[PDB]
Design a binder for this molecule. Structure first.
Ligand code: HEM
Length: 146
């Protein structure tokens, strides 16, 4: 499963190979996959919608809301960036620690949600242990500033 605290897991060559085998299929339809993931998260955890002021007052037809679609792709693109540089641990650390600080003080998001959205991200793309490890690294780092 996905964890959000403790030492960072290490992605093996095997892990990276599996991730790189599965990702292209998702990436090629990033708009709809990214949207589906966020919508699923909001359906499973309606109480999490309060964490997105840009669409927190929006009810019904979220799929057509520009703020919802944009929020979804911004999250997806960050994951895409990380996958694109799995060989550079330092870059991933630096980048995500900075983002962690922004979510804490600027976006004022409760770090408890990262793991929940990530779980839905993984199940949506039918990812396996390899992706859970990837998202564990991502969540631990996004939770680091808290
Ligand atoms: C895999 C997990 C996640 C990743 C990789 C991620 C990534 C991002 C990125 C890259 C941005 C844009 C940064 C910027 O504009 O400077 C962002 C913004 C934001 N994220 Fe996250 N995020 C994640 C999970 C969450 C969760 C769980 C919530 C809320 C429950 C959340 C709420 C927000 C909000 C409110 C913004 C600000 C949007 C805006 O004002 O334009 N994020 N996130």
């Amino acid at each position: 499963p996905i964890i959000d605290q403790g030492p960072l897991p290490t992605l093996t060559d095997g892990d990276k190979k599996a991730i790189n085998k599965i990702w292209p299929k998702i990436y090629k339809e990033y708009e709809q996959y990214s949207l589906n993931i966020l919508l699923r998260f909001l359906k499973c955890f309606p109480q999490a919608q309060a964490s997105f002021p840009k669409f927190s007052t929006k009810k019904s037809n979220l799929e057509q809301d520009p703020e919802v679609k944009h929020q979804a792709v911004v999250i997806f693109n960050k994951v895409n960036e990380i996958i694109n540089s799995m060989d550079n641990q330092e870059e991933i650390i630096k980048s995500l620690k900075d983002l962690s600080q922004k979510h804490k003080t600027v976006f004022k998001v409760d770090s408890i949600w990262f793991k929940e959205l990530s779980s839905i991200f993984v199940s949506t793309i039918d990812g396996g242990a390899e992706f859970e490890k990837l998202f564990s690294i991502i969540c631990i780092l996004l939770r680091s500033a808290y």
